[PDB]
Every structure is written in structure tokens, then in C-alpha cells.
Ligand binder design. Structure first.
Ligand SMILES: Cc1cc2nc3c(=O)[nH]c(=O)nc-3n(C[C@H](O)[C@H](O)[C@H](O)COP(=O)(O)O)c2cc1C
Ligand SMILES: Cc1cc2nc3c(=O)[nH]c(=O)nc-3n(C[C@H](O)[C@H](O)[C@H](O)COP(=O)(O)O)c2cc1C
Ligand SMILES: Cc1cc2nc3c(=O)[nH]c(=O)nc-3n(C[C@H](O)[C@H](O)[C@H](O)COP(=O)(O)O)c2cc1C
Ligand SMILES: Cc1cc2nc3c(=O)[nH]c(=O)nc-3n(C[C@H](O)[C@H](O)[C@H](O)COP(=O)(O)O)c2cc1C
Lengths: 374, 374, 374, 374
């Protein structure tokens, strides 16, 4: 509650939560988050066929159990762009957080730094860098930009992020206009508070505004020059985020990207597009070790983390389930989810004969041509 | 008391409507359209498995989002057979618009004309040429014939169509007898008004007749000679409509057709046949640029428009959604649907990196061998 | 009803019926046929997945509409083994009939005879040859044997069939023991009346016996020798019925069979087996024109008839739909079903460009690798 | 009651039961077994998609009915490792029979020896060996272990099994940690019984062990040396159980395994893995006759037994259906299930043309590329 908060009443309770599986968290969160903001978080484009595809894609490649593999206390730690992290997942950049919990991004930040991974800060955060920093307590962070049409504004934002301690920049390029998000349209959803970091290029405050109008204020005519100019201007490794087609990965690397972030924005953008995990092997094969790959869009289980790594990702990024955890328990709730994914992965590692994160990368997967219904 | 009717009570309200997606228009229209007429419009052959196939076919080939493309305010305009149109879609020829709205084909014509595309006029209109002309106000029109058995009556229909200003003729050849339309059979659907363009070759004057008997007063024994003779007589470009097999595209072109219209009649004809979109690539490859291709049967989204163009259609034709929009709001309801399609396509163009309609034609699509269920 | 029934109240009413599709006939028949007999007729082995397979197989190969073909009043007539028949379908041998209607096999016989096709008489009829002959009125018939273990009894049965007027013998070889018919097990189904043709080797009545014990009385150790011997003894062309594997077709033909009858007994026999129509092309390719093929198991629509002919069958045999028609209206109800199939096929011929039954045999079908769910 | 067990209200009645199919037994047993313990038996990892895969896999390869095969009274008997058994299925090792019935493993042992097959005894069974031995009354038995961390404990348990007359050892190696069994977590289920067969050999991390913490307390770091050592120390043929990947079959054999036991532990272990049946042919082809194969996980029908044998298994092992039978009627209920499988297989054998169990191994199966939904 600052200049924004009105009749939007986000949960405020802080507690650890029992996570049996992350799927149940959606319905659980529907009972604590205001209808508009909940459906903004949970919903996807069209009739959500592609979000369902993100989920069902994991049944296309199945894990073998493996035995007498000489493996005992699996270690989930890994390293990406110099950061040593407790497990091979990071927090995806997500604009929402105040929609889910009054402690907002600072809540998520505390869970992420206490767990021991990397926080990605969305340009569309409801919290300032200062507020997020207090939650991170010096933990690592990456900053995600939605580009302004005005170059000076981009250079200011990047300077603020770097000054704040960002050690990579995430260029989200799959959102030059909004997806067709039927739930938000039908609800007439509107952000109930401000976006302090991108404020400088919105007609007024984000507060009364639709997402369609926030994107749209952003840069539509993103080109490979933008990738080069952001890497050049910031001193920092640049990820290009939203990639589903291998030619865009070759393009981004040749334009100076230091990482490829394979994603379909959790199916919130282009409708009637593939499940994200289905696109990963061809992108990995084109990238061919040139830069690290972050994978997201549909990760719900430790099995999914293992499959992504076997298929070419260095790490995955987590989204909705952590935000559902934040709704239900603030920072401790979000931490419960992160802790669930580590323990879930540890079980999968033991059963697949994987001693460490590198072993996961060499797993052979069973191909399932029958799909979901088998 | 309106002296023309016995008792069919079509909606008459004129207003713009919201359109979140075109699928919802179906149930909304069922609320205002008399039962028999509504189910004539919505229904299809058999248990409607092929109507479902028309819709599920769109998931067989998926769009890639593409980033850093160098794209900003896409332009949906295109040209076909000399007509500059505002978007790469036209109005499909559909019988008896009076079943949907009291303004009938004049209402449709007004929406189509004002939006900026081509009107196709069904030989089975409940409206005269002069009535539809008042709606078009000089806008482009194509005339779709259901042939008479008698050559002179076809010459006369063609002469009237051309005198009215028709700039192409559409020979619909997939309806030599009716499909097995179970809804219409169970409702005992009969037309509540006459059809002035084809009245000449009906024994009666269409009002209490079944479609079964109307088709079937029309010509059953269509042969490639009819294509030659229609082309010869009415020296306008001829489309052969209803094509699903590539051999028929080649046959029609060699018989003098100037266009191929790929369609299964919105699944109202042959049952247990493929979804129309699945047939398109093979027809396009056989046509091999010789004449333009119109594609229809199941187009509901901008994504579908894009996939059709990427797969070799020059434009698509829209049917049910526009007629539902007419039911709900007369010319303004129909206009709202066309406007929806233009804006829906624009988003898709932006997210796929397509600056113009030509760029759409060059899109690679992701093959999805899993089905609808993924 | 006859002098056997324990207390079985079969319908007796004789009327023509409106058939919109044959699938609705199943539920309509359930309202008038006693529970036990109804589920004996409608049911299949296990959880009926293979009966479902029989029906869904028809979606694996899809018909193309064809246009400007030069076609007008399609002729359904054909000829098999010297019989000129009105349409390319015959009556399958069915041991039910008095379970469906008090007029029994004589009622079905009258419908088939008046329609103008071939009646197949089951060895497990609840009617005598003389009873069936009065219904047939000189109409053509084929006799289906369930073999006795004793040779002499088989000779006696074949002689009675031939002296009755049988012009072919159908050896059903796929029922050496009963399928696992869950409905009949749970209903404790037992025949309410006798089976006069095979009574000689039952040592008793079929009345109050289970199908398991009746099948148990017929011959289990059928070998190729039985094919040779039946052909040798009778004057007659012998079909082997129940064939799903191409090697059995080659075997049957080399053992003296004059026809191959592709069937899985309407899924009443071996469970977790393919849909019948999926097995047909490989049998046809191996038969390679040597003898005529009859196809059954799942035929519900004129499209199914077309597909089977296009895939190598000379005729199809009809079963459950006709018996449901019999339950509903006696011979007139059975007739309404035959007449429906004739008209249904006529529509399909016109839409596919088939002037006659030979033209159907040359149709190409579209392969649908996606399932039923598309 | 044993004062040392947690109170648990298992069924105690003993009666033969009617078995129409094994699937209906699950629901029937749910009415008499305590909720927690019932769901422990019935449930599986995650949302149970891999348990469903186990069941749907059987629809990937379909049986052909075969005719004129000269077959009459099929013989289900077979032999494995010198044991002559009445049918090609054995009891799978399961430690939790007392959850189904108060007679625990002694009840199932009675059914299994009365029927004439092999009883697999979990070392961690609820019943005492003397109780189980009384049930077996001399019948053949195999013993299943987990590797303990403590080597001496392994030697002691193996000696115990050999002195108890075990003629083979089953090393279950797919459970180095527990699967994610949502039902048990959600039900807060605590397994109630002790482990009298091995209590007393329990050392170190295994001290105070129960099924509640077996997995964690036993050996995680199993290597091929464990297999060698077990085979070396024991006199006996050793099966390695839980194999789904062909490399693991080759490893186990090269390490001295006398048998490969293909299994996913009834889907109670690794989630989002293939259905067990789908893994079988690749394992069989790699084994290539070196040692016998036991197959389990999803066997519910005689058709499944036949498909497994056709696909390279020597025998299958049964689990859940036998426990549901034990719940419903003690040893006689369990016996009714074994007897059902024997009759079910006999019918399949007759209809596939298989005179004996060797013939089943020669069966060609029909590949069904469409899925379960056909
Ligand atoms: C509530 C919501 C808000 C999001 N906001 C952003 C954003 O500000 N910037 C961005 O790059 N991605 C954003 N994303 C996309 C995520 O970074 C990520 O791609 C997505 O959450 C992965 O899908 P999943 O959560 O279903 O696994 C958002 C996603 C959701 C769920
Ligand atoms: C209500 C209705 C009437 C139609 N009438 C005609 C007609 O008179 N002539 C014609 O060529 N096609 C006619 N069609 C077929 C359409 O031209 C077009 O093929 C179909 O609407 C496309 O399928 P869709 O509307 O589901 O997208 C009709 C379709 C429907 C919905
Ligand atoms: C009620 C019932 C009884 C049958 N009785 C016999 C029979 O006595 N002899 C035989 O060869 N086939 C018999 N059949 C199999 C049929 O000949 C035929 O293969 C089956 O009806 C085709 O399946 P469909 O009716 O589902 O299309 C019977 C089928 C059913 C429906
Ligand atoms: C309740 C339950 C407990 C089990 N306990 C063991 C165990 O003690 N040791 C073992 O090797 N397998 C165990 N299994 C796996 C079985 O040996 C067998 O692999 C499984 O039951 C096969 O799956 P199905 O029962 O669904 O056909 C258990 C399975 C279930 C059903």
C-alpha cells in the first residue's frame, strides 16, 4: 500500500505450505486471489489450447528408470554465467507479483535468495529496485526489459538495472503486442497499481491500464540491432527471451546475445503455436553449445526439469507455481515451492541414475509417439 | 403483421457487438434465431465429425512466434483478380440470410462493402440482385451459381449476374445432392421464403421446400464441359468451389477455371471426409501458382487466416461467424465480425514477423503429429 | 411368440420406421426389447473397446468429395456369385432373431427378400428352414454352419440347407469358444427358446442354455480339412468367415474356399484385437482377386459401404442395425433399415463421383494418421 | 491382534468370488478395505498417468483371431527355471498383503500353491515365514529383497531365504528412493505392520525399519557389483527387477543375473515414464534368450498374458488384481482371480490358434499406431 492500492486486496499471510504437487496450487490460489488478478495470472491466449500443449508436451518424451547406477546423494547444484546456484532453476521474470501477495516482488525475492538461486526482475514490477533489493539481501538478480520506443529511456532503465546489481539483461521479444487473453478481455481486467520502473514511458500510471495498452506503449519494431545495442550499452550478458524457432536462436547469437531463453511466455502470447518443450531439441541442436539455454513455459515437476536438461537446457525458469505459492504463503509459500522442485528433482535424479546436474544432461529419453492419451 | 411472412421471426435489431472470439457467437445467436433456421445454419452432415475435423485441422500445423523481425504496424491489405481488399478474406456465398436477420443479404452486403472486401452472392439468396445492390452501394461482388439443368436459364442467370456487376462467377459443384444433415431432417427444416434468382427452375417458389428438393432441381450431372461453357459465356473468371482432391483442381484449370476454391461446404456435404485445411497443401502444390486459391471451411481465428496463406491460399472465405454476427446485430453485427478478423490477423502478423500479407505466405509452420489432444 | 420362450416378451408390432441414422436405433430398440436379449444383441467382448474400434476404424480412411464427374442417377446394383442384388450389401448370419421380434427370422427374411438381396441363415436360428422359407418367398439365401463335432450330422445339416435352397455355405470359424461377453455374464443370459437346426448335437434344447455351452457343443478343432470337406460334400461355394489375418485368407483359398468373409463377429469374439475395417486392405492385397470378399463388423452408414468397396470388398454384410430395425418394426422396420442403407449409399456415390458400384471400387481414400480425435 | 502392529481393520472373510473382469475388483475391494490402506494398494506416482500408460499400452499391439488352426483344448502349463507351473503367471513380490486381508501373505500363498504356481515372497512381508510356509504347504517360492546398506545384513537375509527353501532371489532395484505417491501423502497413510521375516537381521540405518522408511533406510548406491555379490553369495538364480531400459538388462546379465524382471513397480516408482509393456520388446531383443524374462505392471486380462508372451516374456507376474481378490475373499478370493486368469488365457489361446504356451510365443501382433482412442 503506497500510492496504488485501492479495493484490490491481495493475500498478506506469510506461512510455509505443504506442496504435494504444483498443479493443486492453482485451484488453491483461486480461493485466495481476487478474481481479476487470479485469472490474469492463470489464464492464457485463446481457449488455452497452447497452455495445455505446454503441459502435455512433457508426455512426448518419457524418462527411463535406471538401476545399479552407483548413485547416492544427488547434488542439484549447478552454475550459469558465473553464478553458483542450489538447483538448475531460476525465477522467471513475471510482472504480477502484487496481484498475488501484498509483499509483491520483495516477497518472491526473499524466497529466491534464501533458496539460493537467481531472481529475474520484470520491467513491469509493481515494486521498485529498492524494494526488491531489500528482499534479495544481496542475492543475484537479472533484469528483464520491455523496450521503450525511446532509446534514451532504454539506456536509463538499463543503467538503473546495472546500478541496482543486475548481472544479466533479459530481452523479452515475444510481446511486441499482447496475446489474445480471453479471460482478461471477458473480465475487463485492469492493473490495480503502478509499474515504477517503466512509468517514464506510459501516458499516466499503469494503474488504470490494460496490458494491451502497456505493450503497445513498448517497442513493436524490435530488430537484431536492438540485441546488439543492448549488449553494447549494458556491460552485461544478454538473453533473448521468447524463442521457439531455431533460426531466431542463430540470429540472436550472431547479433551478440550471450544466452537463449526458450519460451512461449507461458502460452500468454501467440495462440495455436507448439508446446514449448517440443521446440527445445531443435533450438538446442542449432545453438550447439554456443551460449547457455534457459528453458521455460510449462515446468511443474522435477521430471520436467530433468527432461529439459536432457534435451539441451542449462537451467529452467519457474513461473506460475512460484506465484501461486506466493499467493498462499508470501515469501515462505514461494520458498515452499522452490524447495518442492529441489526435492522433486532429487527423487528423479536418484531413480534415473543421475549423481549430479551434468549426468541429467546425458539422459536418453523414451519417445512416445502416442501422445497424451497413449 | 408483415405480408411476406407466415410466421418465421428472424431478429431485426441492428448494433455493433463485442467479439472476444467467434466460437461464442454460435451459442449467442442460438438465443435469437428461430430453432429450425438456427440449426440449418449451425448444423452439418452426420454426427458432424467432419465439422469438428475442419476445426481440429488447424492444430495439425502450428505457428511459430518470431522475434526481432523488423516489423511494426502490419498491413492486411491484398489484391485478388483486380480487387484491392482491406484484408485477405472475402464473404463466402451463403443461402437465405433472412434465416439470420430481417435485413438478410442487404445487411450482409452492407457490412462487407463498408469493411472493404468482396461479397459473394449465393444463387439461393432470399434477396434479389437489386436488393443486394442497395446494400453493396457499388462494392465488389462475385456471383455463385447453382446451375439450372437448362442451358438457357444458366445463360440468363449469368447475364443477370454480370449485368448486376459480378466480376467473377463461382461454380459450386459439391452439392449435386444434399449432405445428410441430421439436424434439418429431425427439425423437418423447410425454407420460410422464396429464392428469386433460382425460382425460374423450381416447380414452386421455394417457400415451403426442403433443401433436398431445391438441390436436385439444380444440375446433378455437372461435367468439365460446364466449367468451359460458363467461362465461355460469361467472360468472367470462374472459380470451381468445393475442391478437396488435387486432381479436381488440375481438371478445373484445364477446363478453363481462373480460380480454385478449396472447401467442403463447411462440412454440410460429404460426411466422413477430411477437415478442409488438411487438403489444402496438396491442392496448392498441384495448382502450382496457375490460378489463385480461395480457401474455406472452418476459419474462426486470425491464426487460421495466416495458416491458410502460409499453406497456399491467396485469401480465405468466411461463413458461419459472419452470419451469426448478422443474427446478433444486422449489418453492424456482421461488420463487428469482419473487424474482429482484421484485428485478430494483425496481432498474428505482428507476432509471426509478417509486415504484410505476402510475408504471411512465406511462413514455415510447425508440424504437430500428435493430434488435437497432443 | 413361439412354443419355446421361458417367458420372453419380444416386440410384435410391424411398421415402417423413420431412419435418420442407424446409431439412434440402438437406444430406441433398448426401450422395447427385454433387458437380457437386448444386451445380448448390443453387447461385445470385454469393455467393448474393439466394438468401439470397429466404429472408429472408419475415420482412418476418409472419402474425398469429387466434382464435375459426370454423374447423375447412381446405380447401387451389383452381382455376387451369380446373384443380382439391389445394393452391394447382404444380411449377415445372426443367431438372435426372436430375441428382437416375435416374427423372428421369418420377419428378417421377408425384409431382405422384398428389398432384393441375400439372406444369411445362422445355424443358431430360433426358426426352422420351413419357417424362414415362407418369409423368403423363393428369395436367395446362404446358410451359415456352426459345425457339429460329428461328420454325419454336418452332412445332414448341409443337405437340409441345400435342399432348402442355399446357394452358398458360410463356415464361421472365429467362435470355437465364446468371446468374454461381460453384459451376458453379468445378466446371466440364457436363450429363452430353442435352436431347431443344431438341436441334434446339443443333446437337449438351446432353451435355458448359455451361449458358452452351445458353442462348446459345436466343433472346436476346425482345421483346413473342414473347409475342403464342406466344399466337397455340399455342391456349394464355401466362405470362411471371421478372417482378420491375411495368412488365413490364403490358407482358406488353398483349402477350397470360394470366398473370404472378413469379420471379427461384431467384436463379440476375440477382445483387444483390431477394428475390422483396419484389417481389410491387407487381406484384400493377399487375396488379390482370387475369390470374392464379403466384409463385416461395424458397417453403420453408406460411407462405410463405399469405404469397404474402395478397399477391396465385393459386398458388405449388415447386422445389428437391421436387427434393431426388426425389434422396432418387424419386417417393415428391418426393411426401413435396408432401404436407408440403399439411399445413404446413393448419396455417397453421387458426392464421390461414382455412377455405379464398380466406380466405388476405384476410389482413392484420404489417409488420416490422427485418430478419431483428429 | 498382534500388540506390536498398529490397529488396522482389514477384511477377514474367506469365500470364492465371481470374477467377470479384474478391473471391477478395484471398486469392489474399495468397499471393504480401510480407505488409507486401499489407496496405498490402488494408487500410483503423481497423477497416475504412468499407471494409466501401463493399462493403455496393451492397446498398442492387438491380437489377431486365427482360424482353422486345428486347436482344441489349450494347455496353459509352462516351466521357468525348472519349476513346472499351471499357467504362465506367478505372484509378484508385494510386502503389503495385510492391507487387503487379515491372513496377509499367508492367504495369498495358499491361493498360489493351491492353484499351482510360484509365490514371490517379499522379505518385508507382514506375515511370519512360518505363517506363509503353512499357507504354501510345500509349494514353490521365490524371495524378494532390497539391497541393505549393511553387507552382513544382505548375507543374513539371503541365508534366511535359502534356508526357507527359496529357489530364486529377486533383487528389486527400482526403489532406491520412494515414488511420489500423492494418494498416500494426501491421506497421511502410515503402514501398520512389522517385518517379522527380516526383523532381527536389521542393522545400522535399517534398525527400526518399516515399509514407511524402507527405500531411504536401504541401499541407494546399488552398483553392478551388488548384483555380482548377491549372485555369488546366494546359491541361487537372481532376478533383477524394475528394468525398463535395455542397457540395464545387458548390465544385469553381465553382472551375473540369472533373469530379467521387466517392471515399473505398478507405476509406484518413477513418474512420467513409459507404460511397462511398451518397454518389453526392446529389452527382449537385447536379452536375446540369454536368461528368462518375467514381465509385470498392468496385467489384467488373459489377452495381456498372451501379448507379453508374444513380445518375449517367459511368464508374467500378477499384483493388484490378486490383492483385490484377497480383500474380497481371503485365499479363496485370491484363488478365484488366479483361476479367472487361467480361464481368460485359455479362451485367448483357442481364438488365437495356440495349443500350448509355446505357440503363444510365436504370435504376430497387429501394430496400432492410433492410440487408445483409435
Ligand atoms: C502472471 C504472468 C506474468 C508474466 N509477466 C512477464 C513479464 O513481465 N516479462 C516476461 O518476460 N515474461 C513474463 N511472463 C512469462 C514468464 O517469464 C514465463 O515465460 C512463464 O511464466 C512460463 O510459463 P509457466 O509459468 O506456465 O511455466 C509472465 C507470466 C505470467 C504467468
Ligand atoms: C448457412 C450456410 C449456407 C450456405 N449456403 C451456400 C450456398 O448457397 N452456396 C455455396 O456455394 N455455399 C454455401 N455455403 C458454404 C459456404 O460457402 C462455405 O463453404 C462455408 O460456410 C465455410 O464453412 P464455415 O462457415 O464453417 O467456415 C453455406 C454455408 C452455410 C454455413
Ligand atoms: C446378435 C448377434 C448374433 C450373431 N450371431 C451370429 C451367428 O449365429 N453366426 C455367425 O456367423 N455370426 C453371428 N453374428 C456375427 C454377425 O454375422 C456379424 O459378423 C456382425 O453382426 C457384424 O457386426 P455388426 O452388426 O456390428 O455390424 C452375430 C452378431 C450379433 C450382432
Ligand atoms: C501395494 C503395492 C506394494 C508393492 N510392494 C512391492 C514390494 O514389496 N517389493 C517389490 O519388489 N515390488 C512391490 N510392488 C510391485 C509389484 O511387485 C509389481 O511390480 C506390481 O504390482 C505390478 O503392477 P500391477 O499390480 O499393477 O500389475 C508392490 C506393488 C503394489 C501394488
Amino acid at each position: 500500500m503506497n500510492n496504488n492500492d485501492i479495493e484490490y486486496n491481495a493475500p498478506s499471510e506469510i506461512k510455509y505450505i505443504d506442496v504435494v504437487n504444483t498443479y493443486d496450487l492453482e485451484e488453491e490460489a483461486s480461493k485466495v486471489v481476487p478474481h481479476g488478478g487470479f485469472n490474469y495470472i492463470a489464464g492464457a491466449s485463446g481457449d488455452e489450447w497452447t497452455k495445455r500443449a505446454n503441459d502435455r508436451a512433457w508426455k512426448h518424451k518419457l524418462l527411463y528408470p535406471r538401476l545399479a547406477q552407483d548413485v547416492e546423494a544427488p547434488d542439484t547444484s549447478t552454475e550459469i554465467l558465473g553464478h553458483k546456484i542450489k538447483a538448475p532453476f531460476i525465477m522467471a521474470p513475471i510482472a504480477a507479483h502484487g496481484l498475488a501477495h501484498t509483499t509483491k516482488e520483495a516477497g518472491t525475492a526473499r524466497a529466491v535468495s534464501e533458496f539460493g538461486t537467481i531472481m529475474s526482475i520484470s520491467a513491469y514490477s509493481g515494486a521498485t529496485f529498492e524494494e526488491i533489493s531489500e528482499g534479495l539481501n544481496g542475492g543475484p538478480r537479472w533484469f528483464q526489459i520491455y523496450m521503450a520506443k525511446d532509446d534514451q529511456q532504454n539506456r536509463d532503465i538499463l543503467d538503473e538495472a546495472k546500478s541496482d546489481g543486475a548481472t544479466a539483461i533479459i530481452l523479452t521479444a515475444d510481446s511486441t503486442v499482447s496475446g489474445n487473453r480471453d479471460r482478461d478481455v471477458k473480465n475487463k481486467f485492469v492493473y490495480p497499481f503502478g509499474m515504477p520502473i517503466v512509468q517514464r514511458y506510459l501516458r499516466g500510471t499503469a494503474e488504470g491500464m490494460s496490458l494491451n495498452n502497456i505493450y503497445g506503449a513498448s517497442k513493436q519494431k524490435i530488430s537484431p540491432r536492438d540485441i546488439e545495442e543492448i549488449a553494447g550499452h549494458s556491460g552485461l550478458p544478454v538473453f533473448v527471451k521468447g524463442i521457439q524457432h531455431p533460426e531466431d536462436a542463430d540470429m540472436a547469437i550472431k547479433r551478440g546475445a550471450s544466452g537463449i531463453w526458450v519460451s512461449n511466455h507461458g502460452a500468454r502470447q501467440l495462440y495455436e503455436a507448439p508446446g514449448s518443450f517440443d521446440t527445445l531439441p531443435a533450438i538446442a541442436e542449432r545453438v550447439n553449445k554456443r551460449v547457455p539455454i534457459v528453458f521455460d513455459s510449462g515446468v511443474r515437476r522435477g521430471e520436467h526439469v530433468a527432461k529439459a536438461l536432457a534435451s539441451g537446457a542449462d537451467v529452467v525458469a519457474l513461473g506460475r507455481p512460484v506465484l501461486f505459492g506466493l499467493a498462499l504463503g508470501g515469501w515462505q509459500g514461494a520458498y515452499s515451492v522452490l524447495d518442492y522442485f529441489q526435492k522433486d528433482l532429487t527423487r528423479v535424479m536418484q531413480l534415473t541414475g543421475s549423481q549430479n546436474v551434468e549426468d541429467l544432461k546425458g539422459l536418453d529419453l523414451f519417445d512416445n509417439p502416442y501422445g497424451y492419451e497413449y
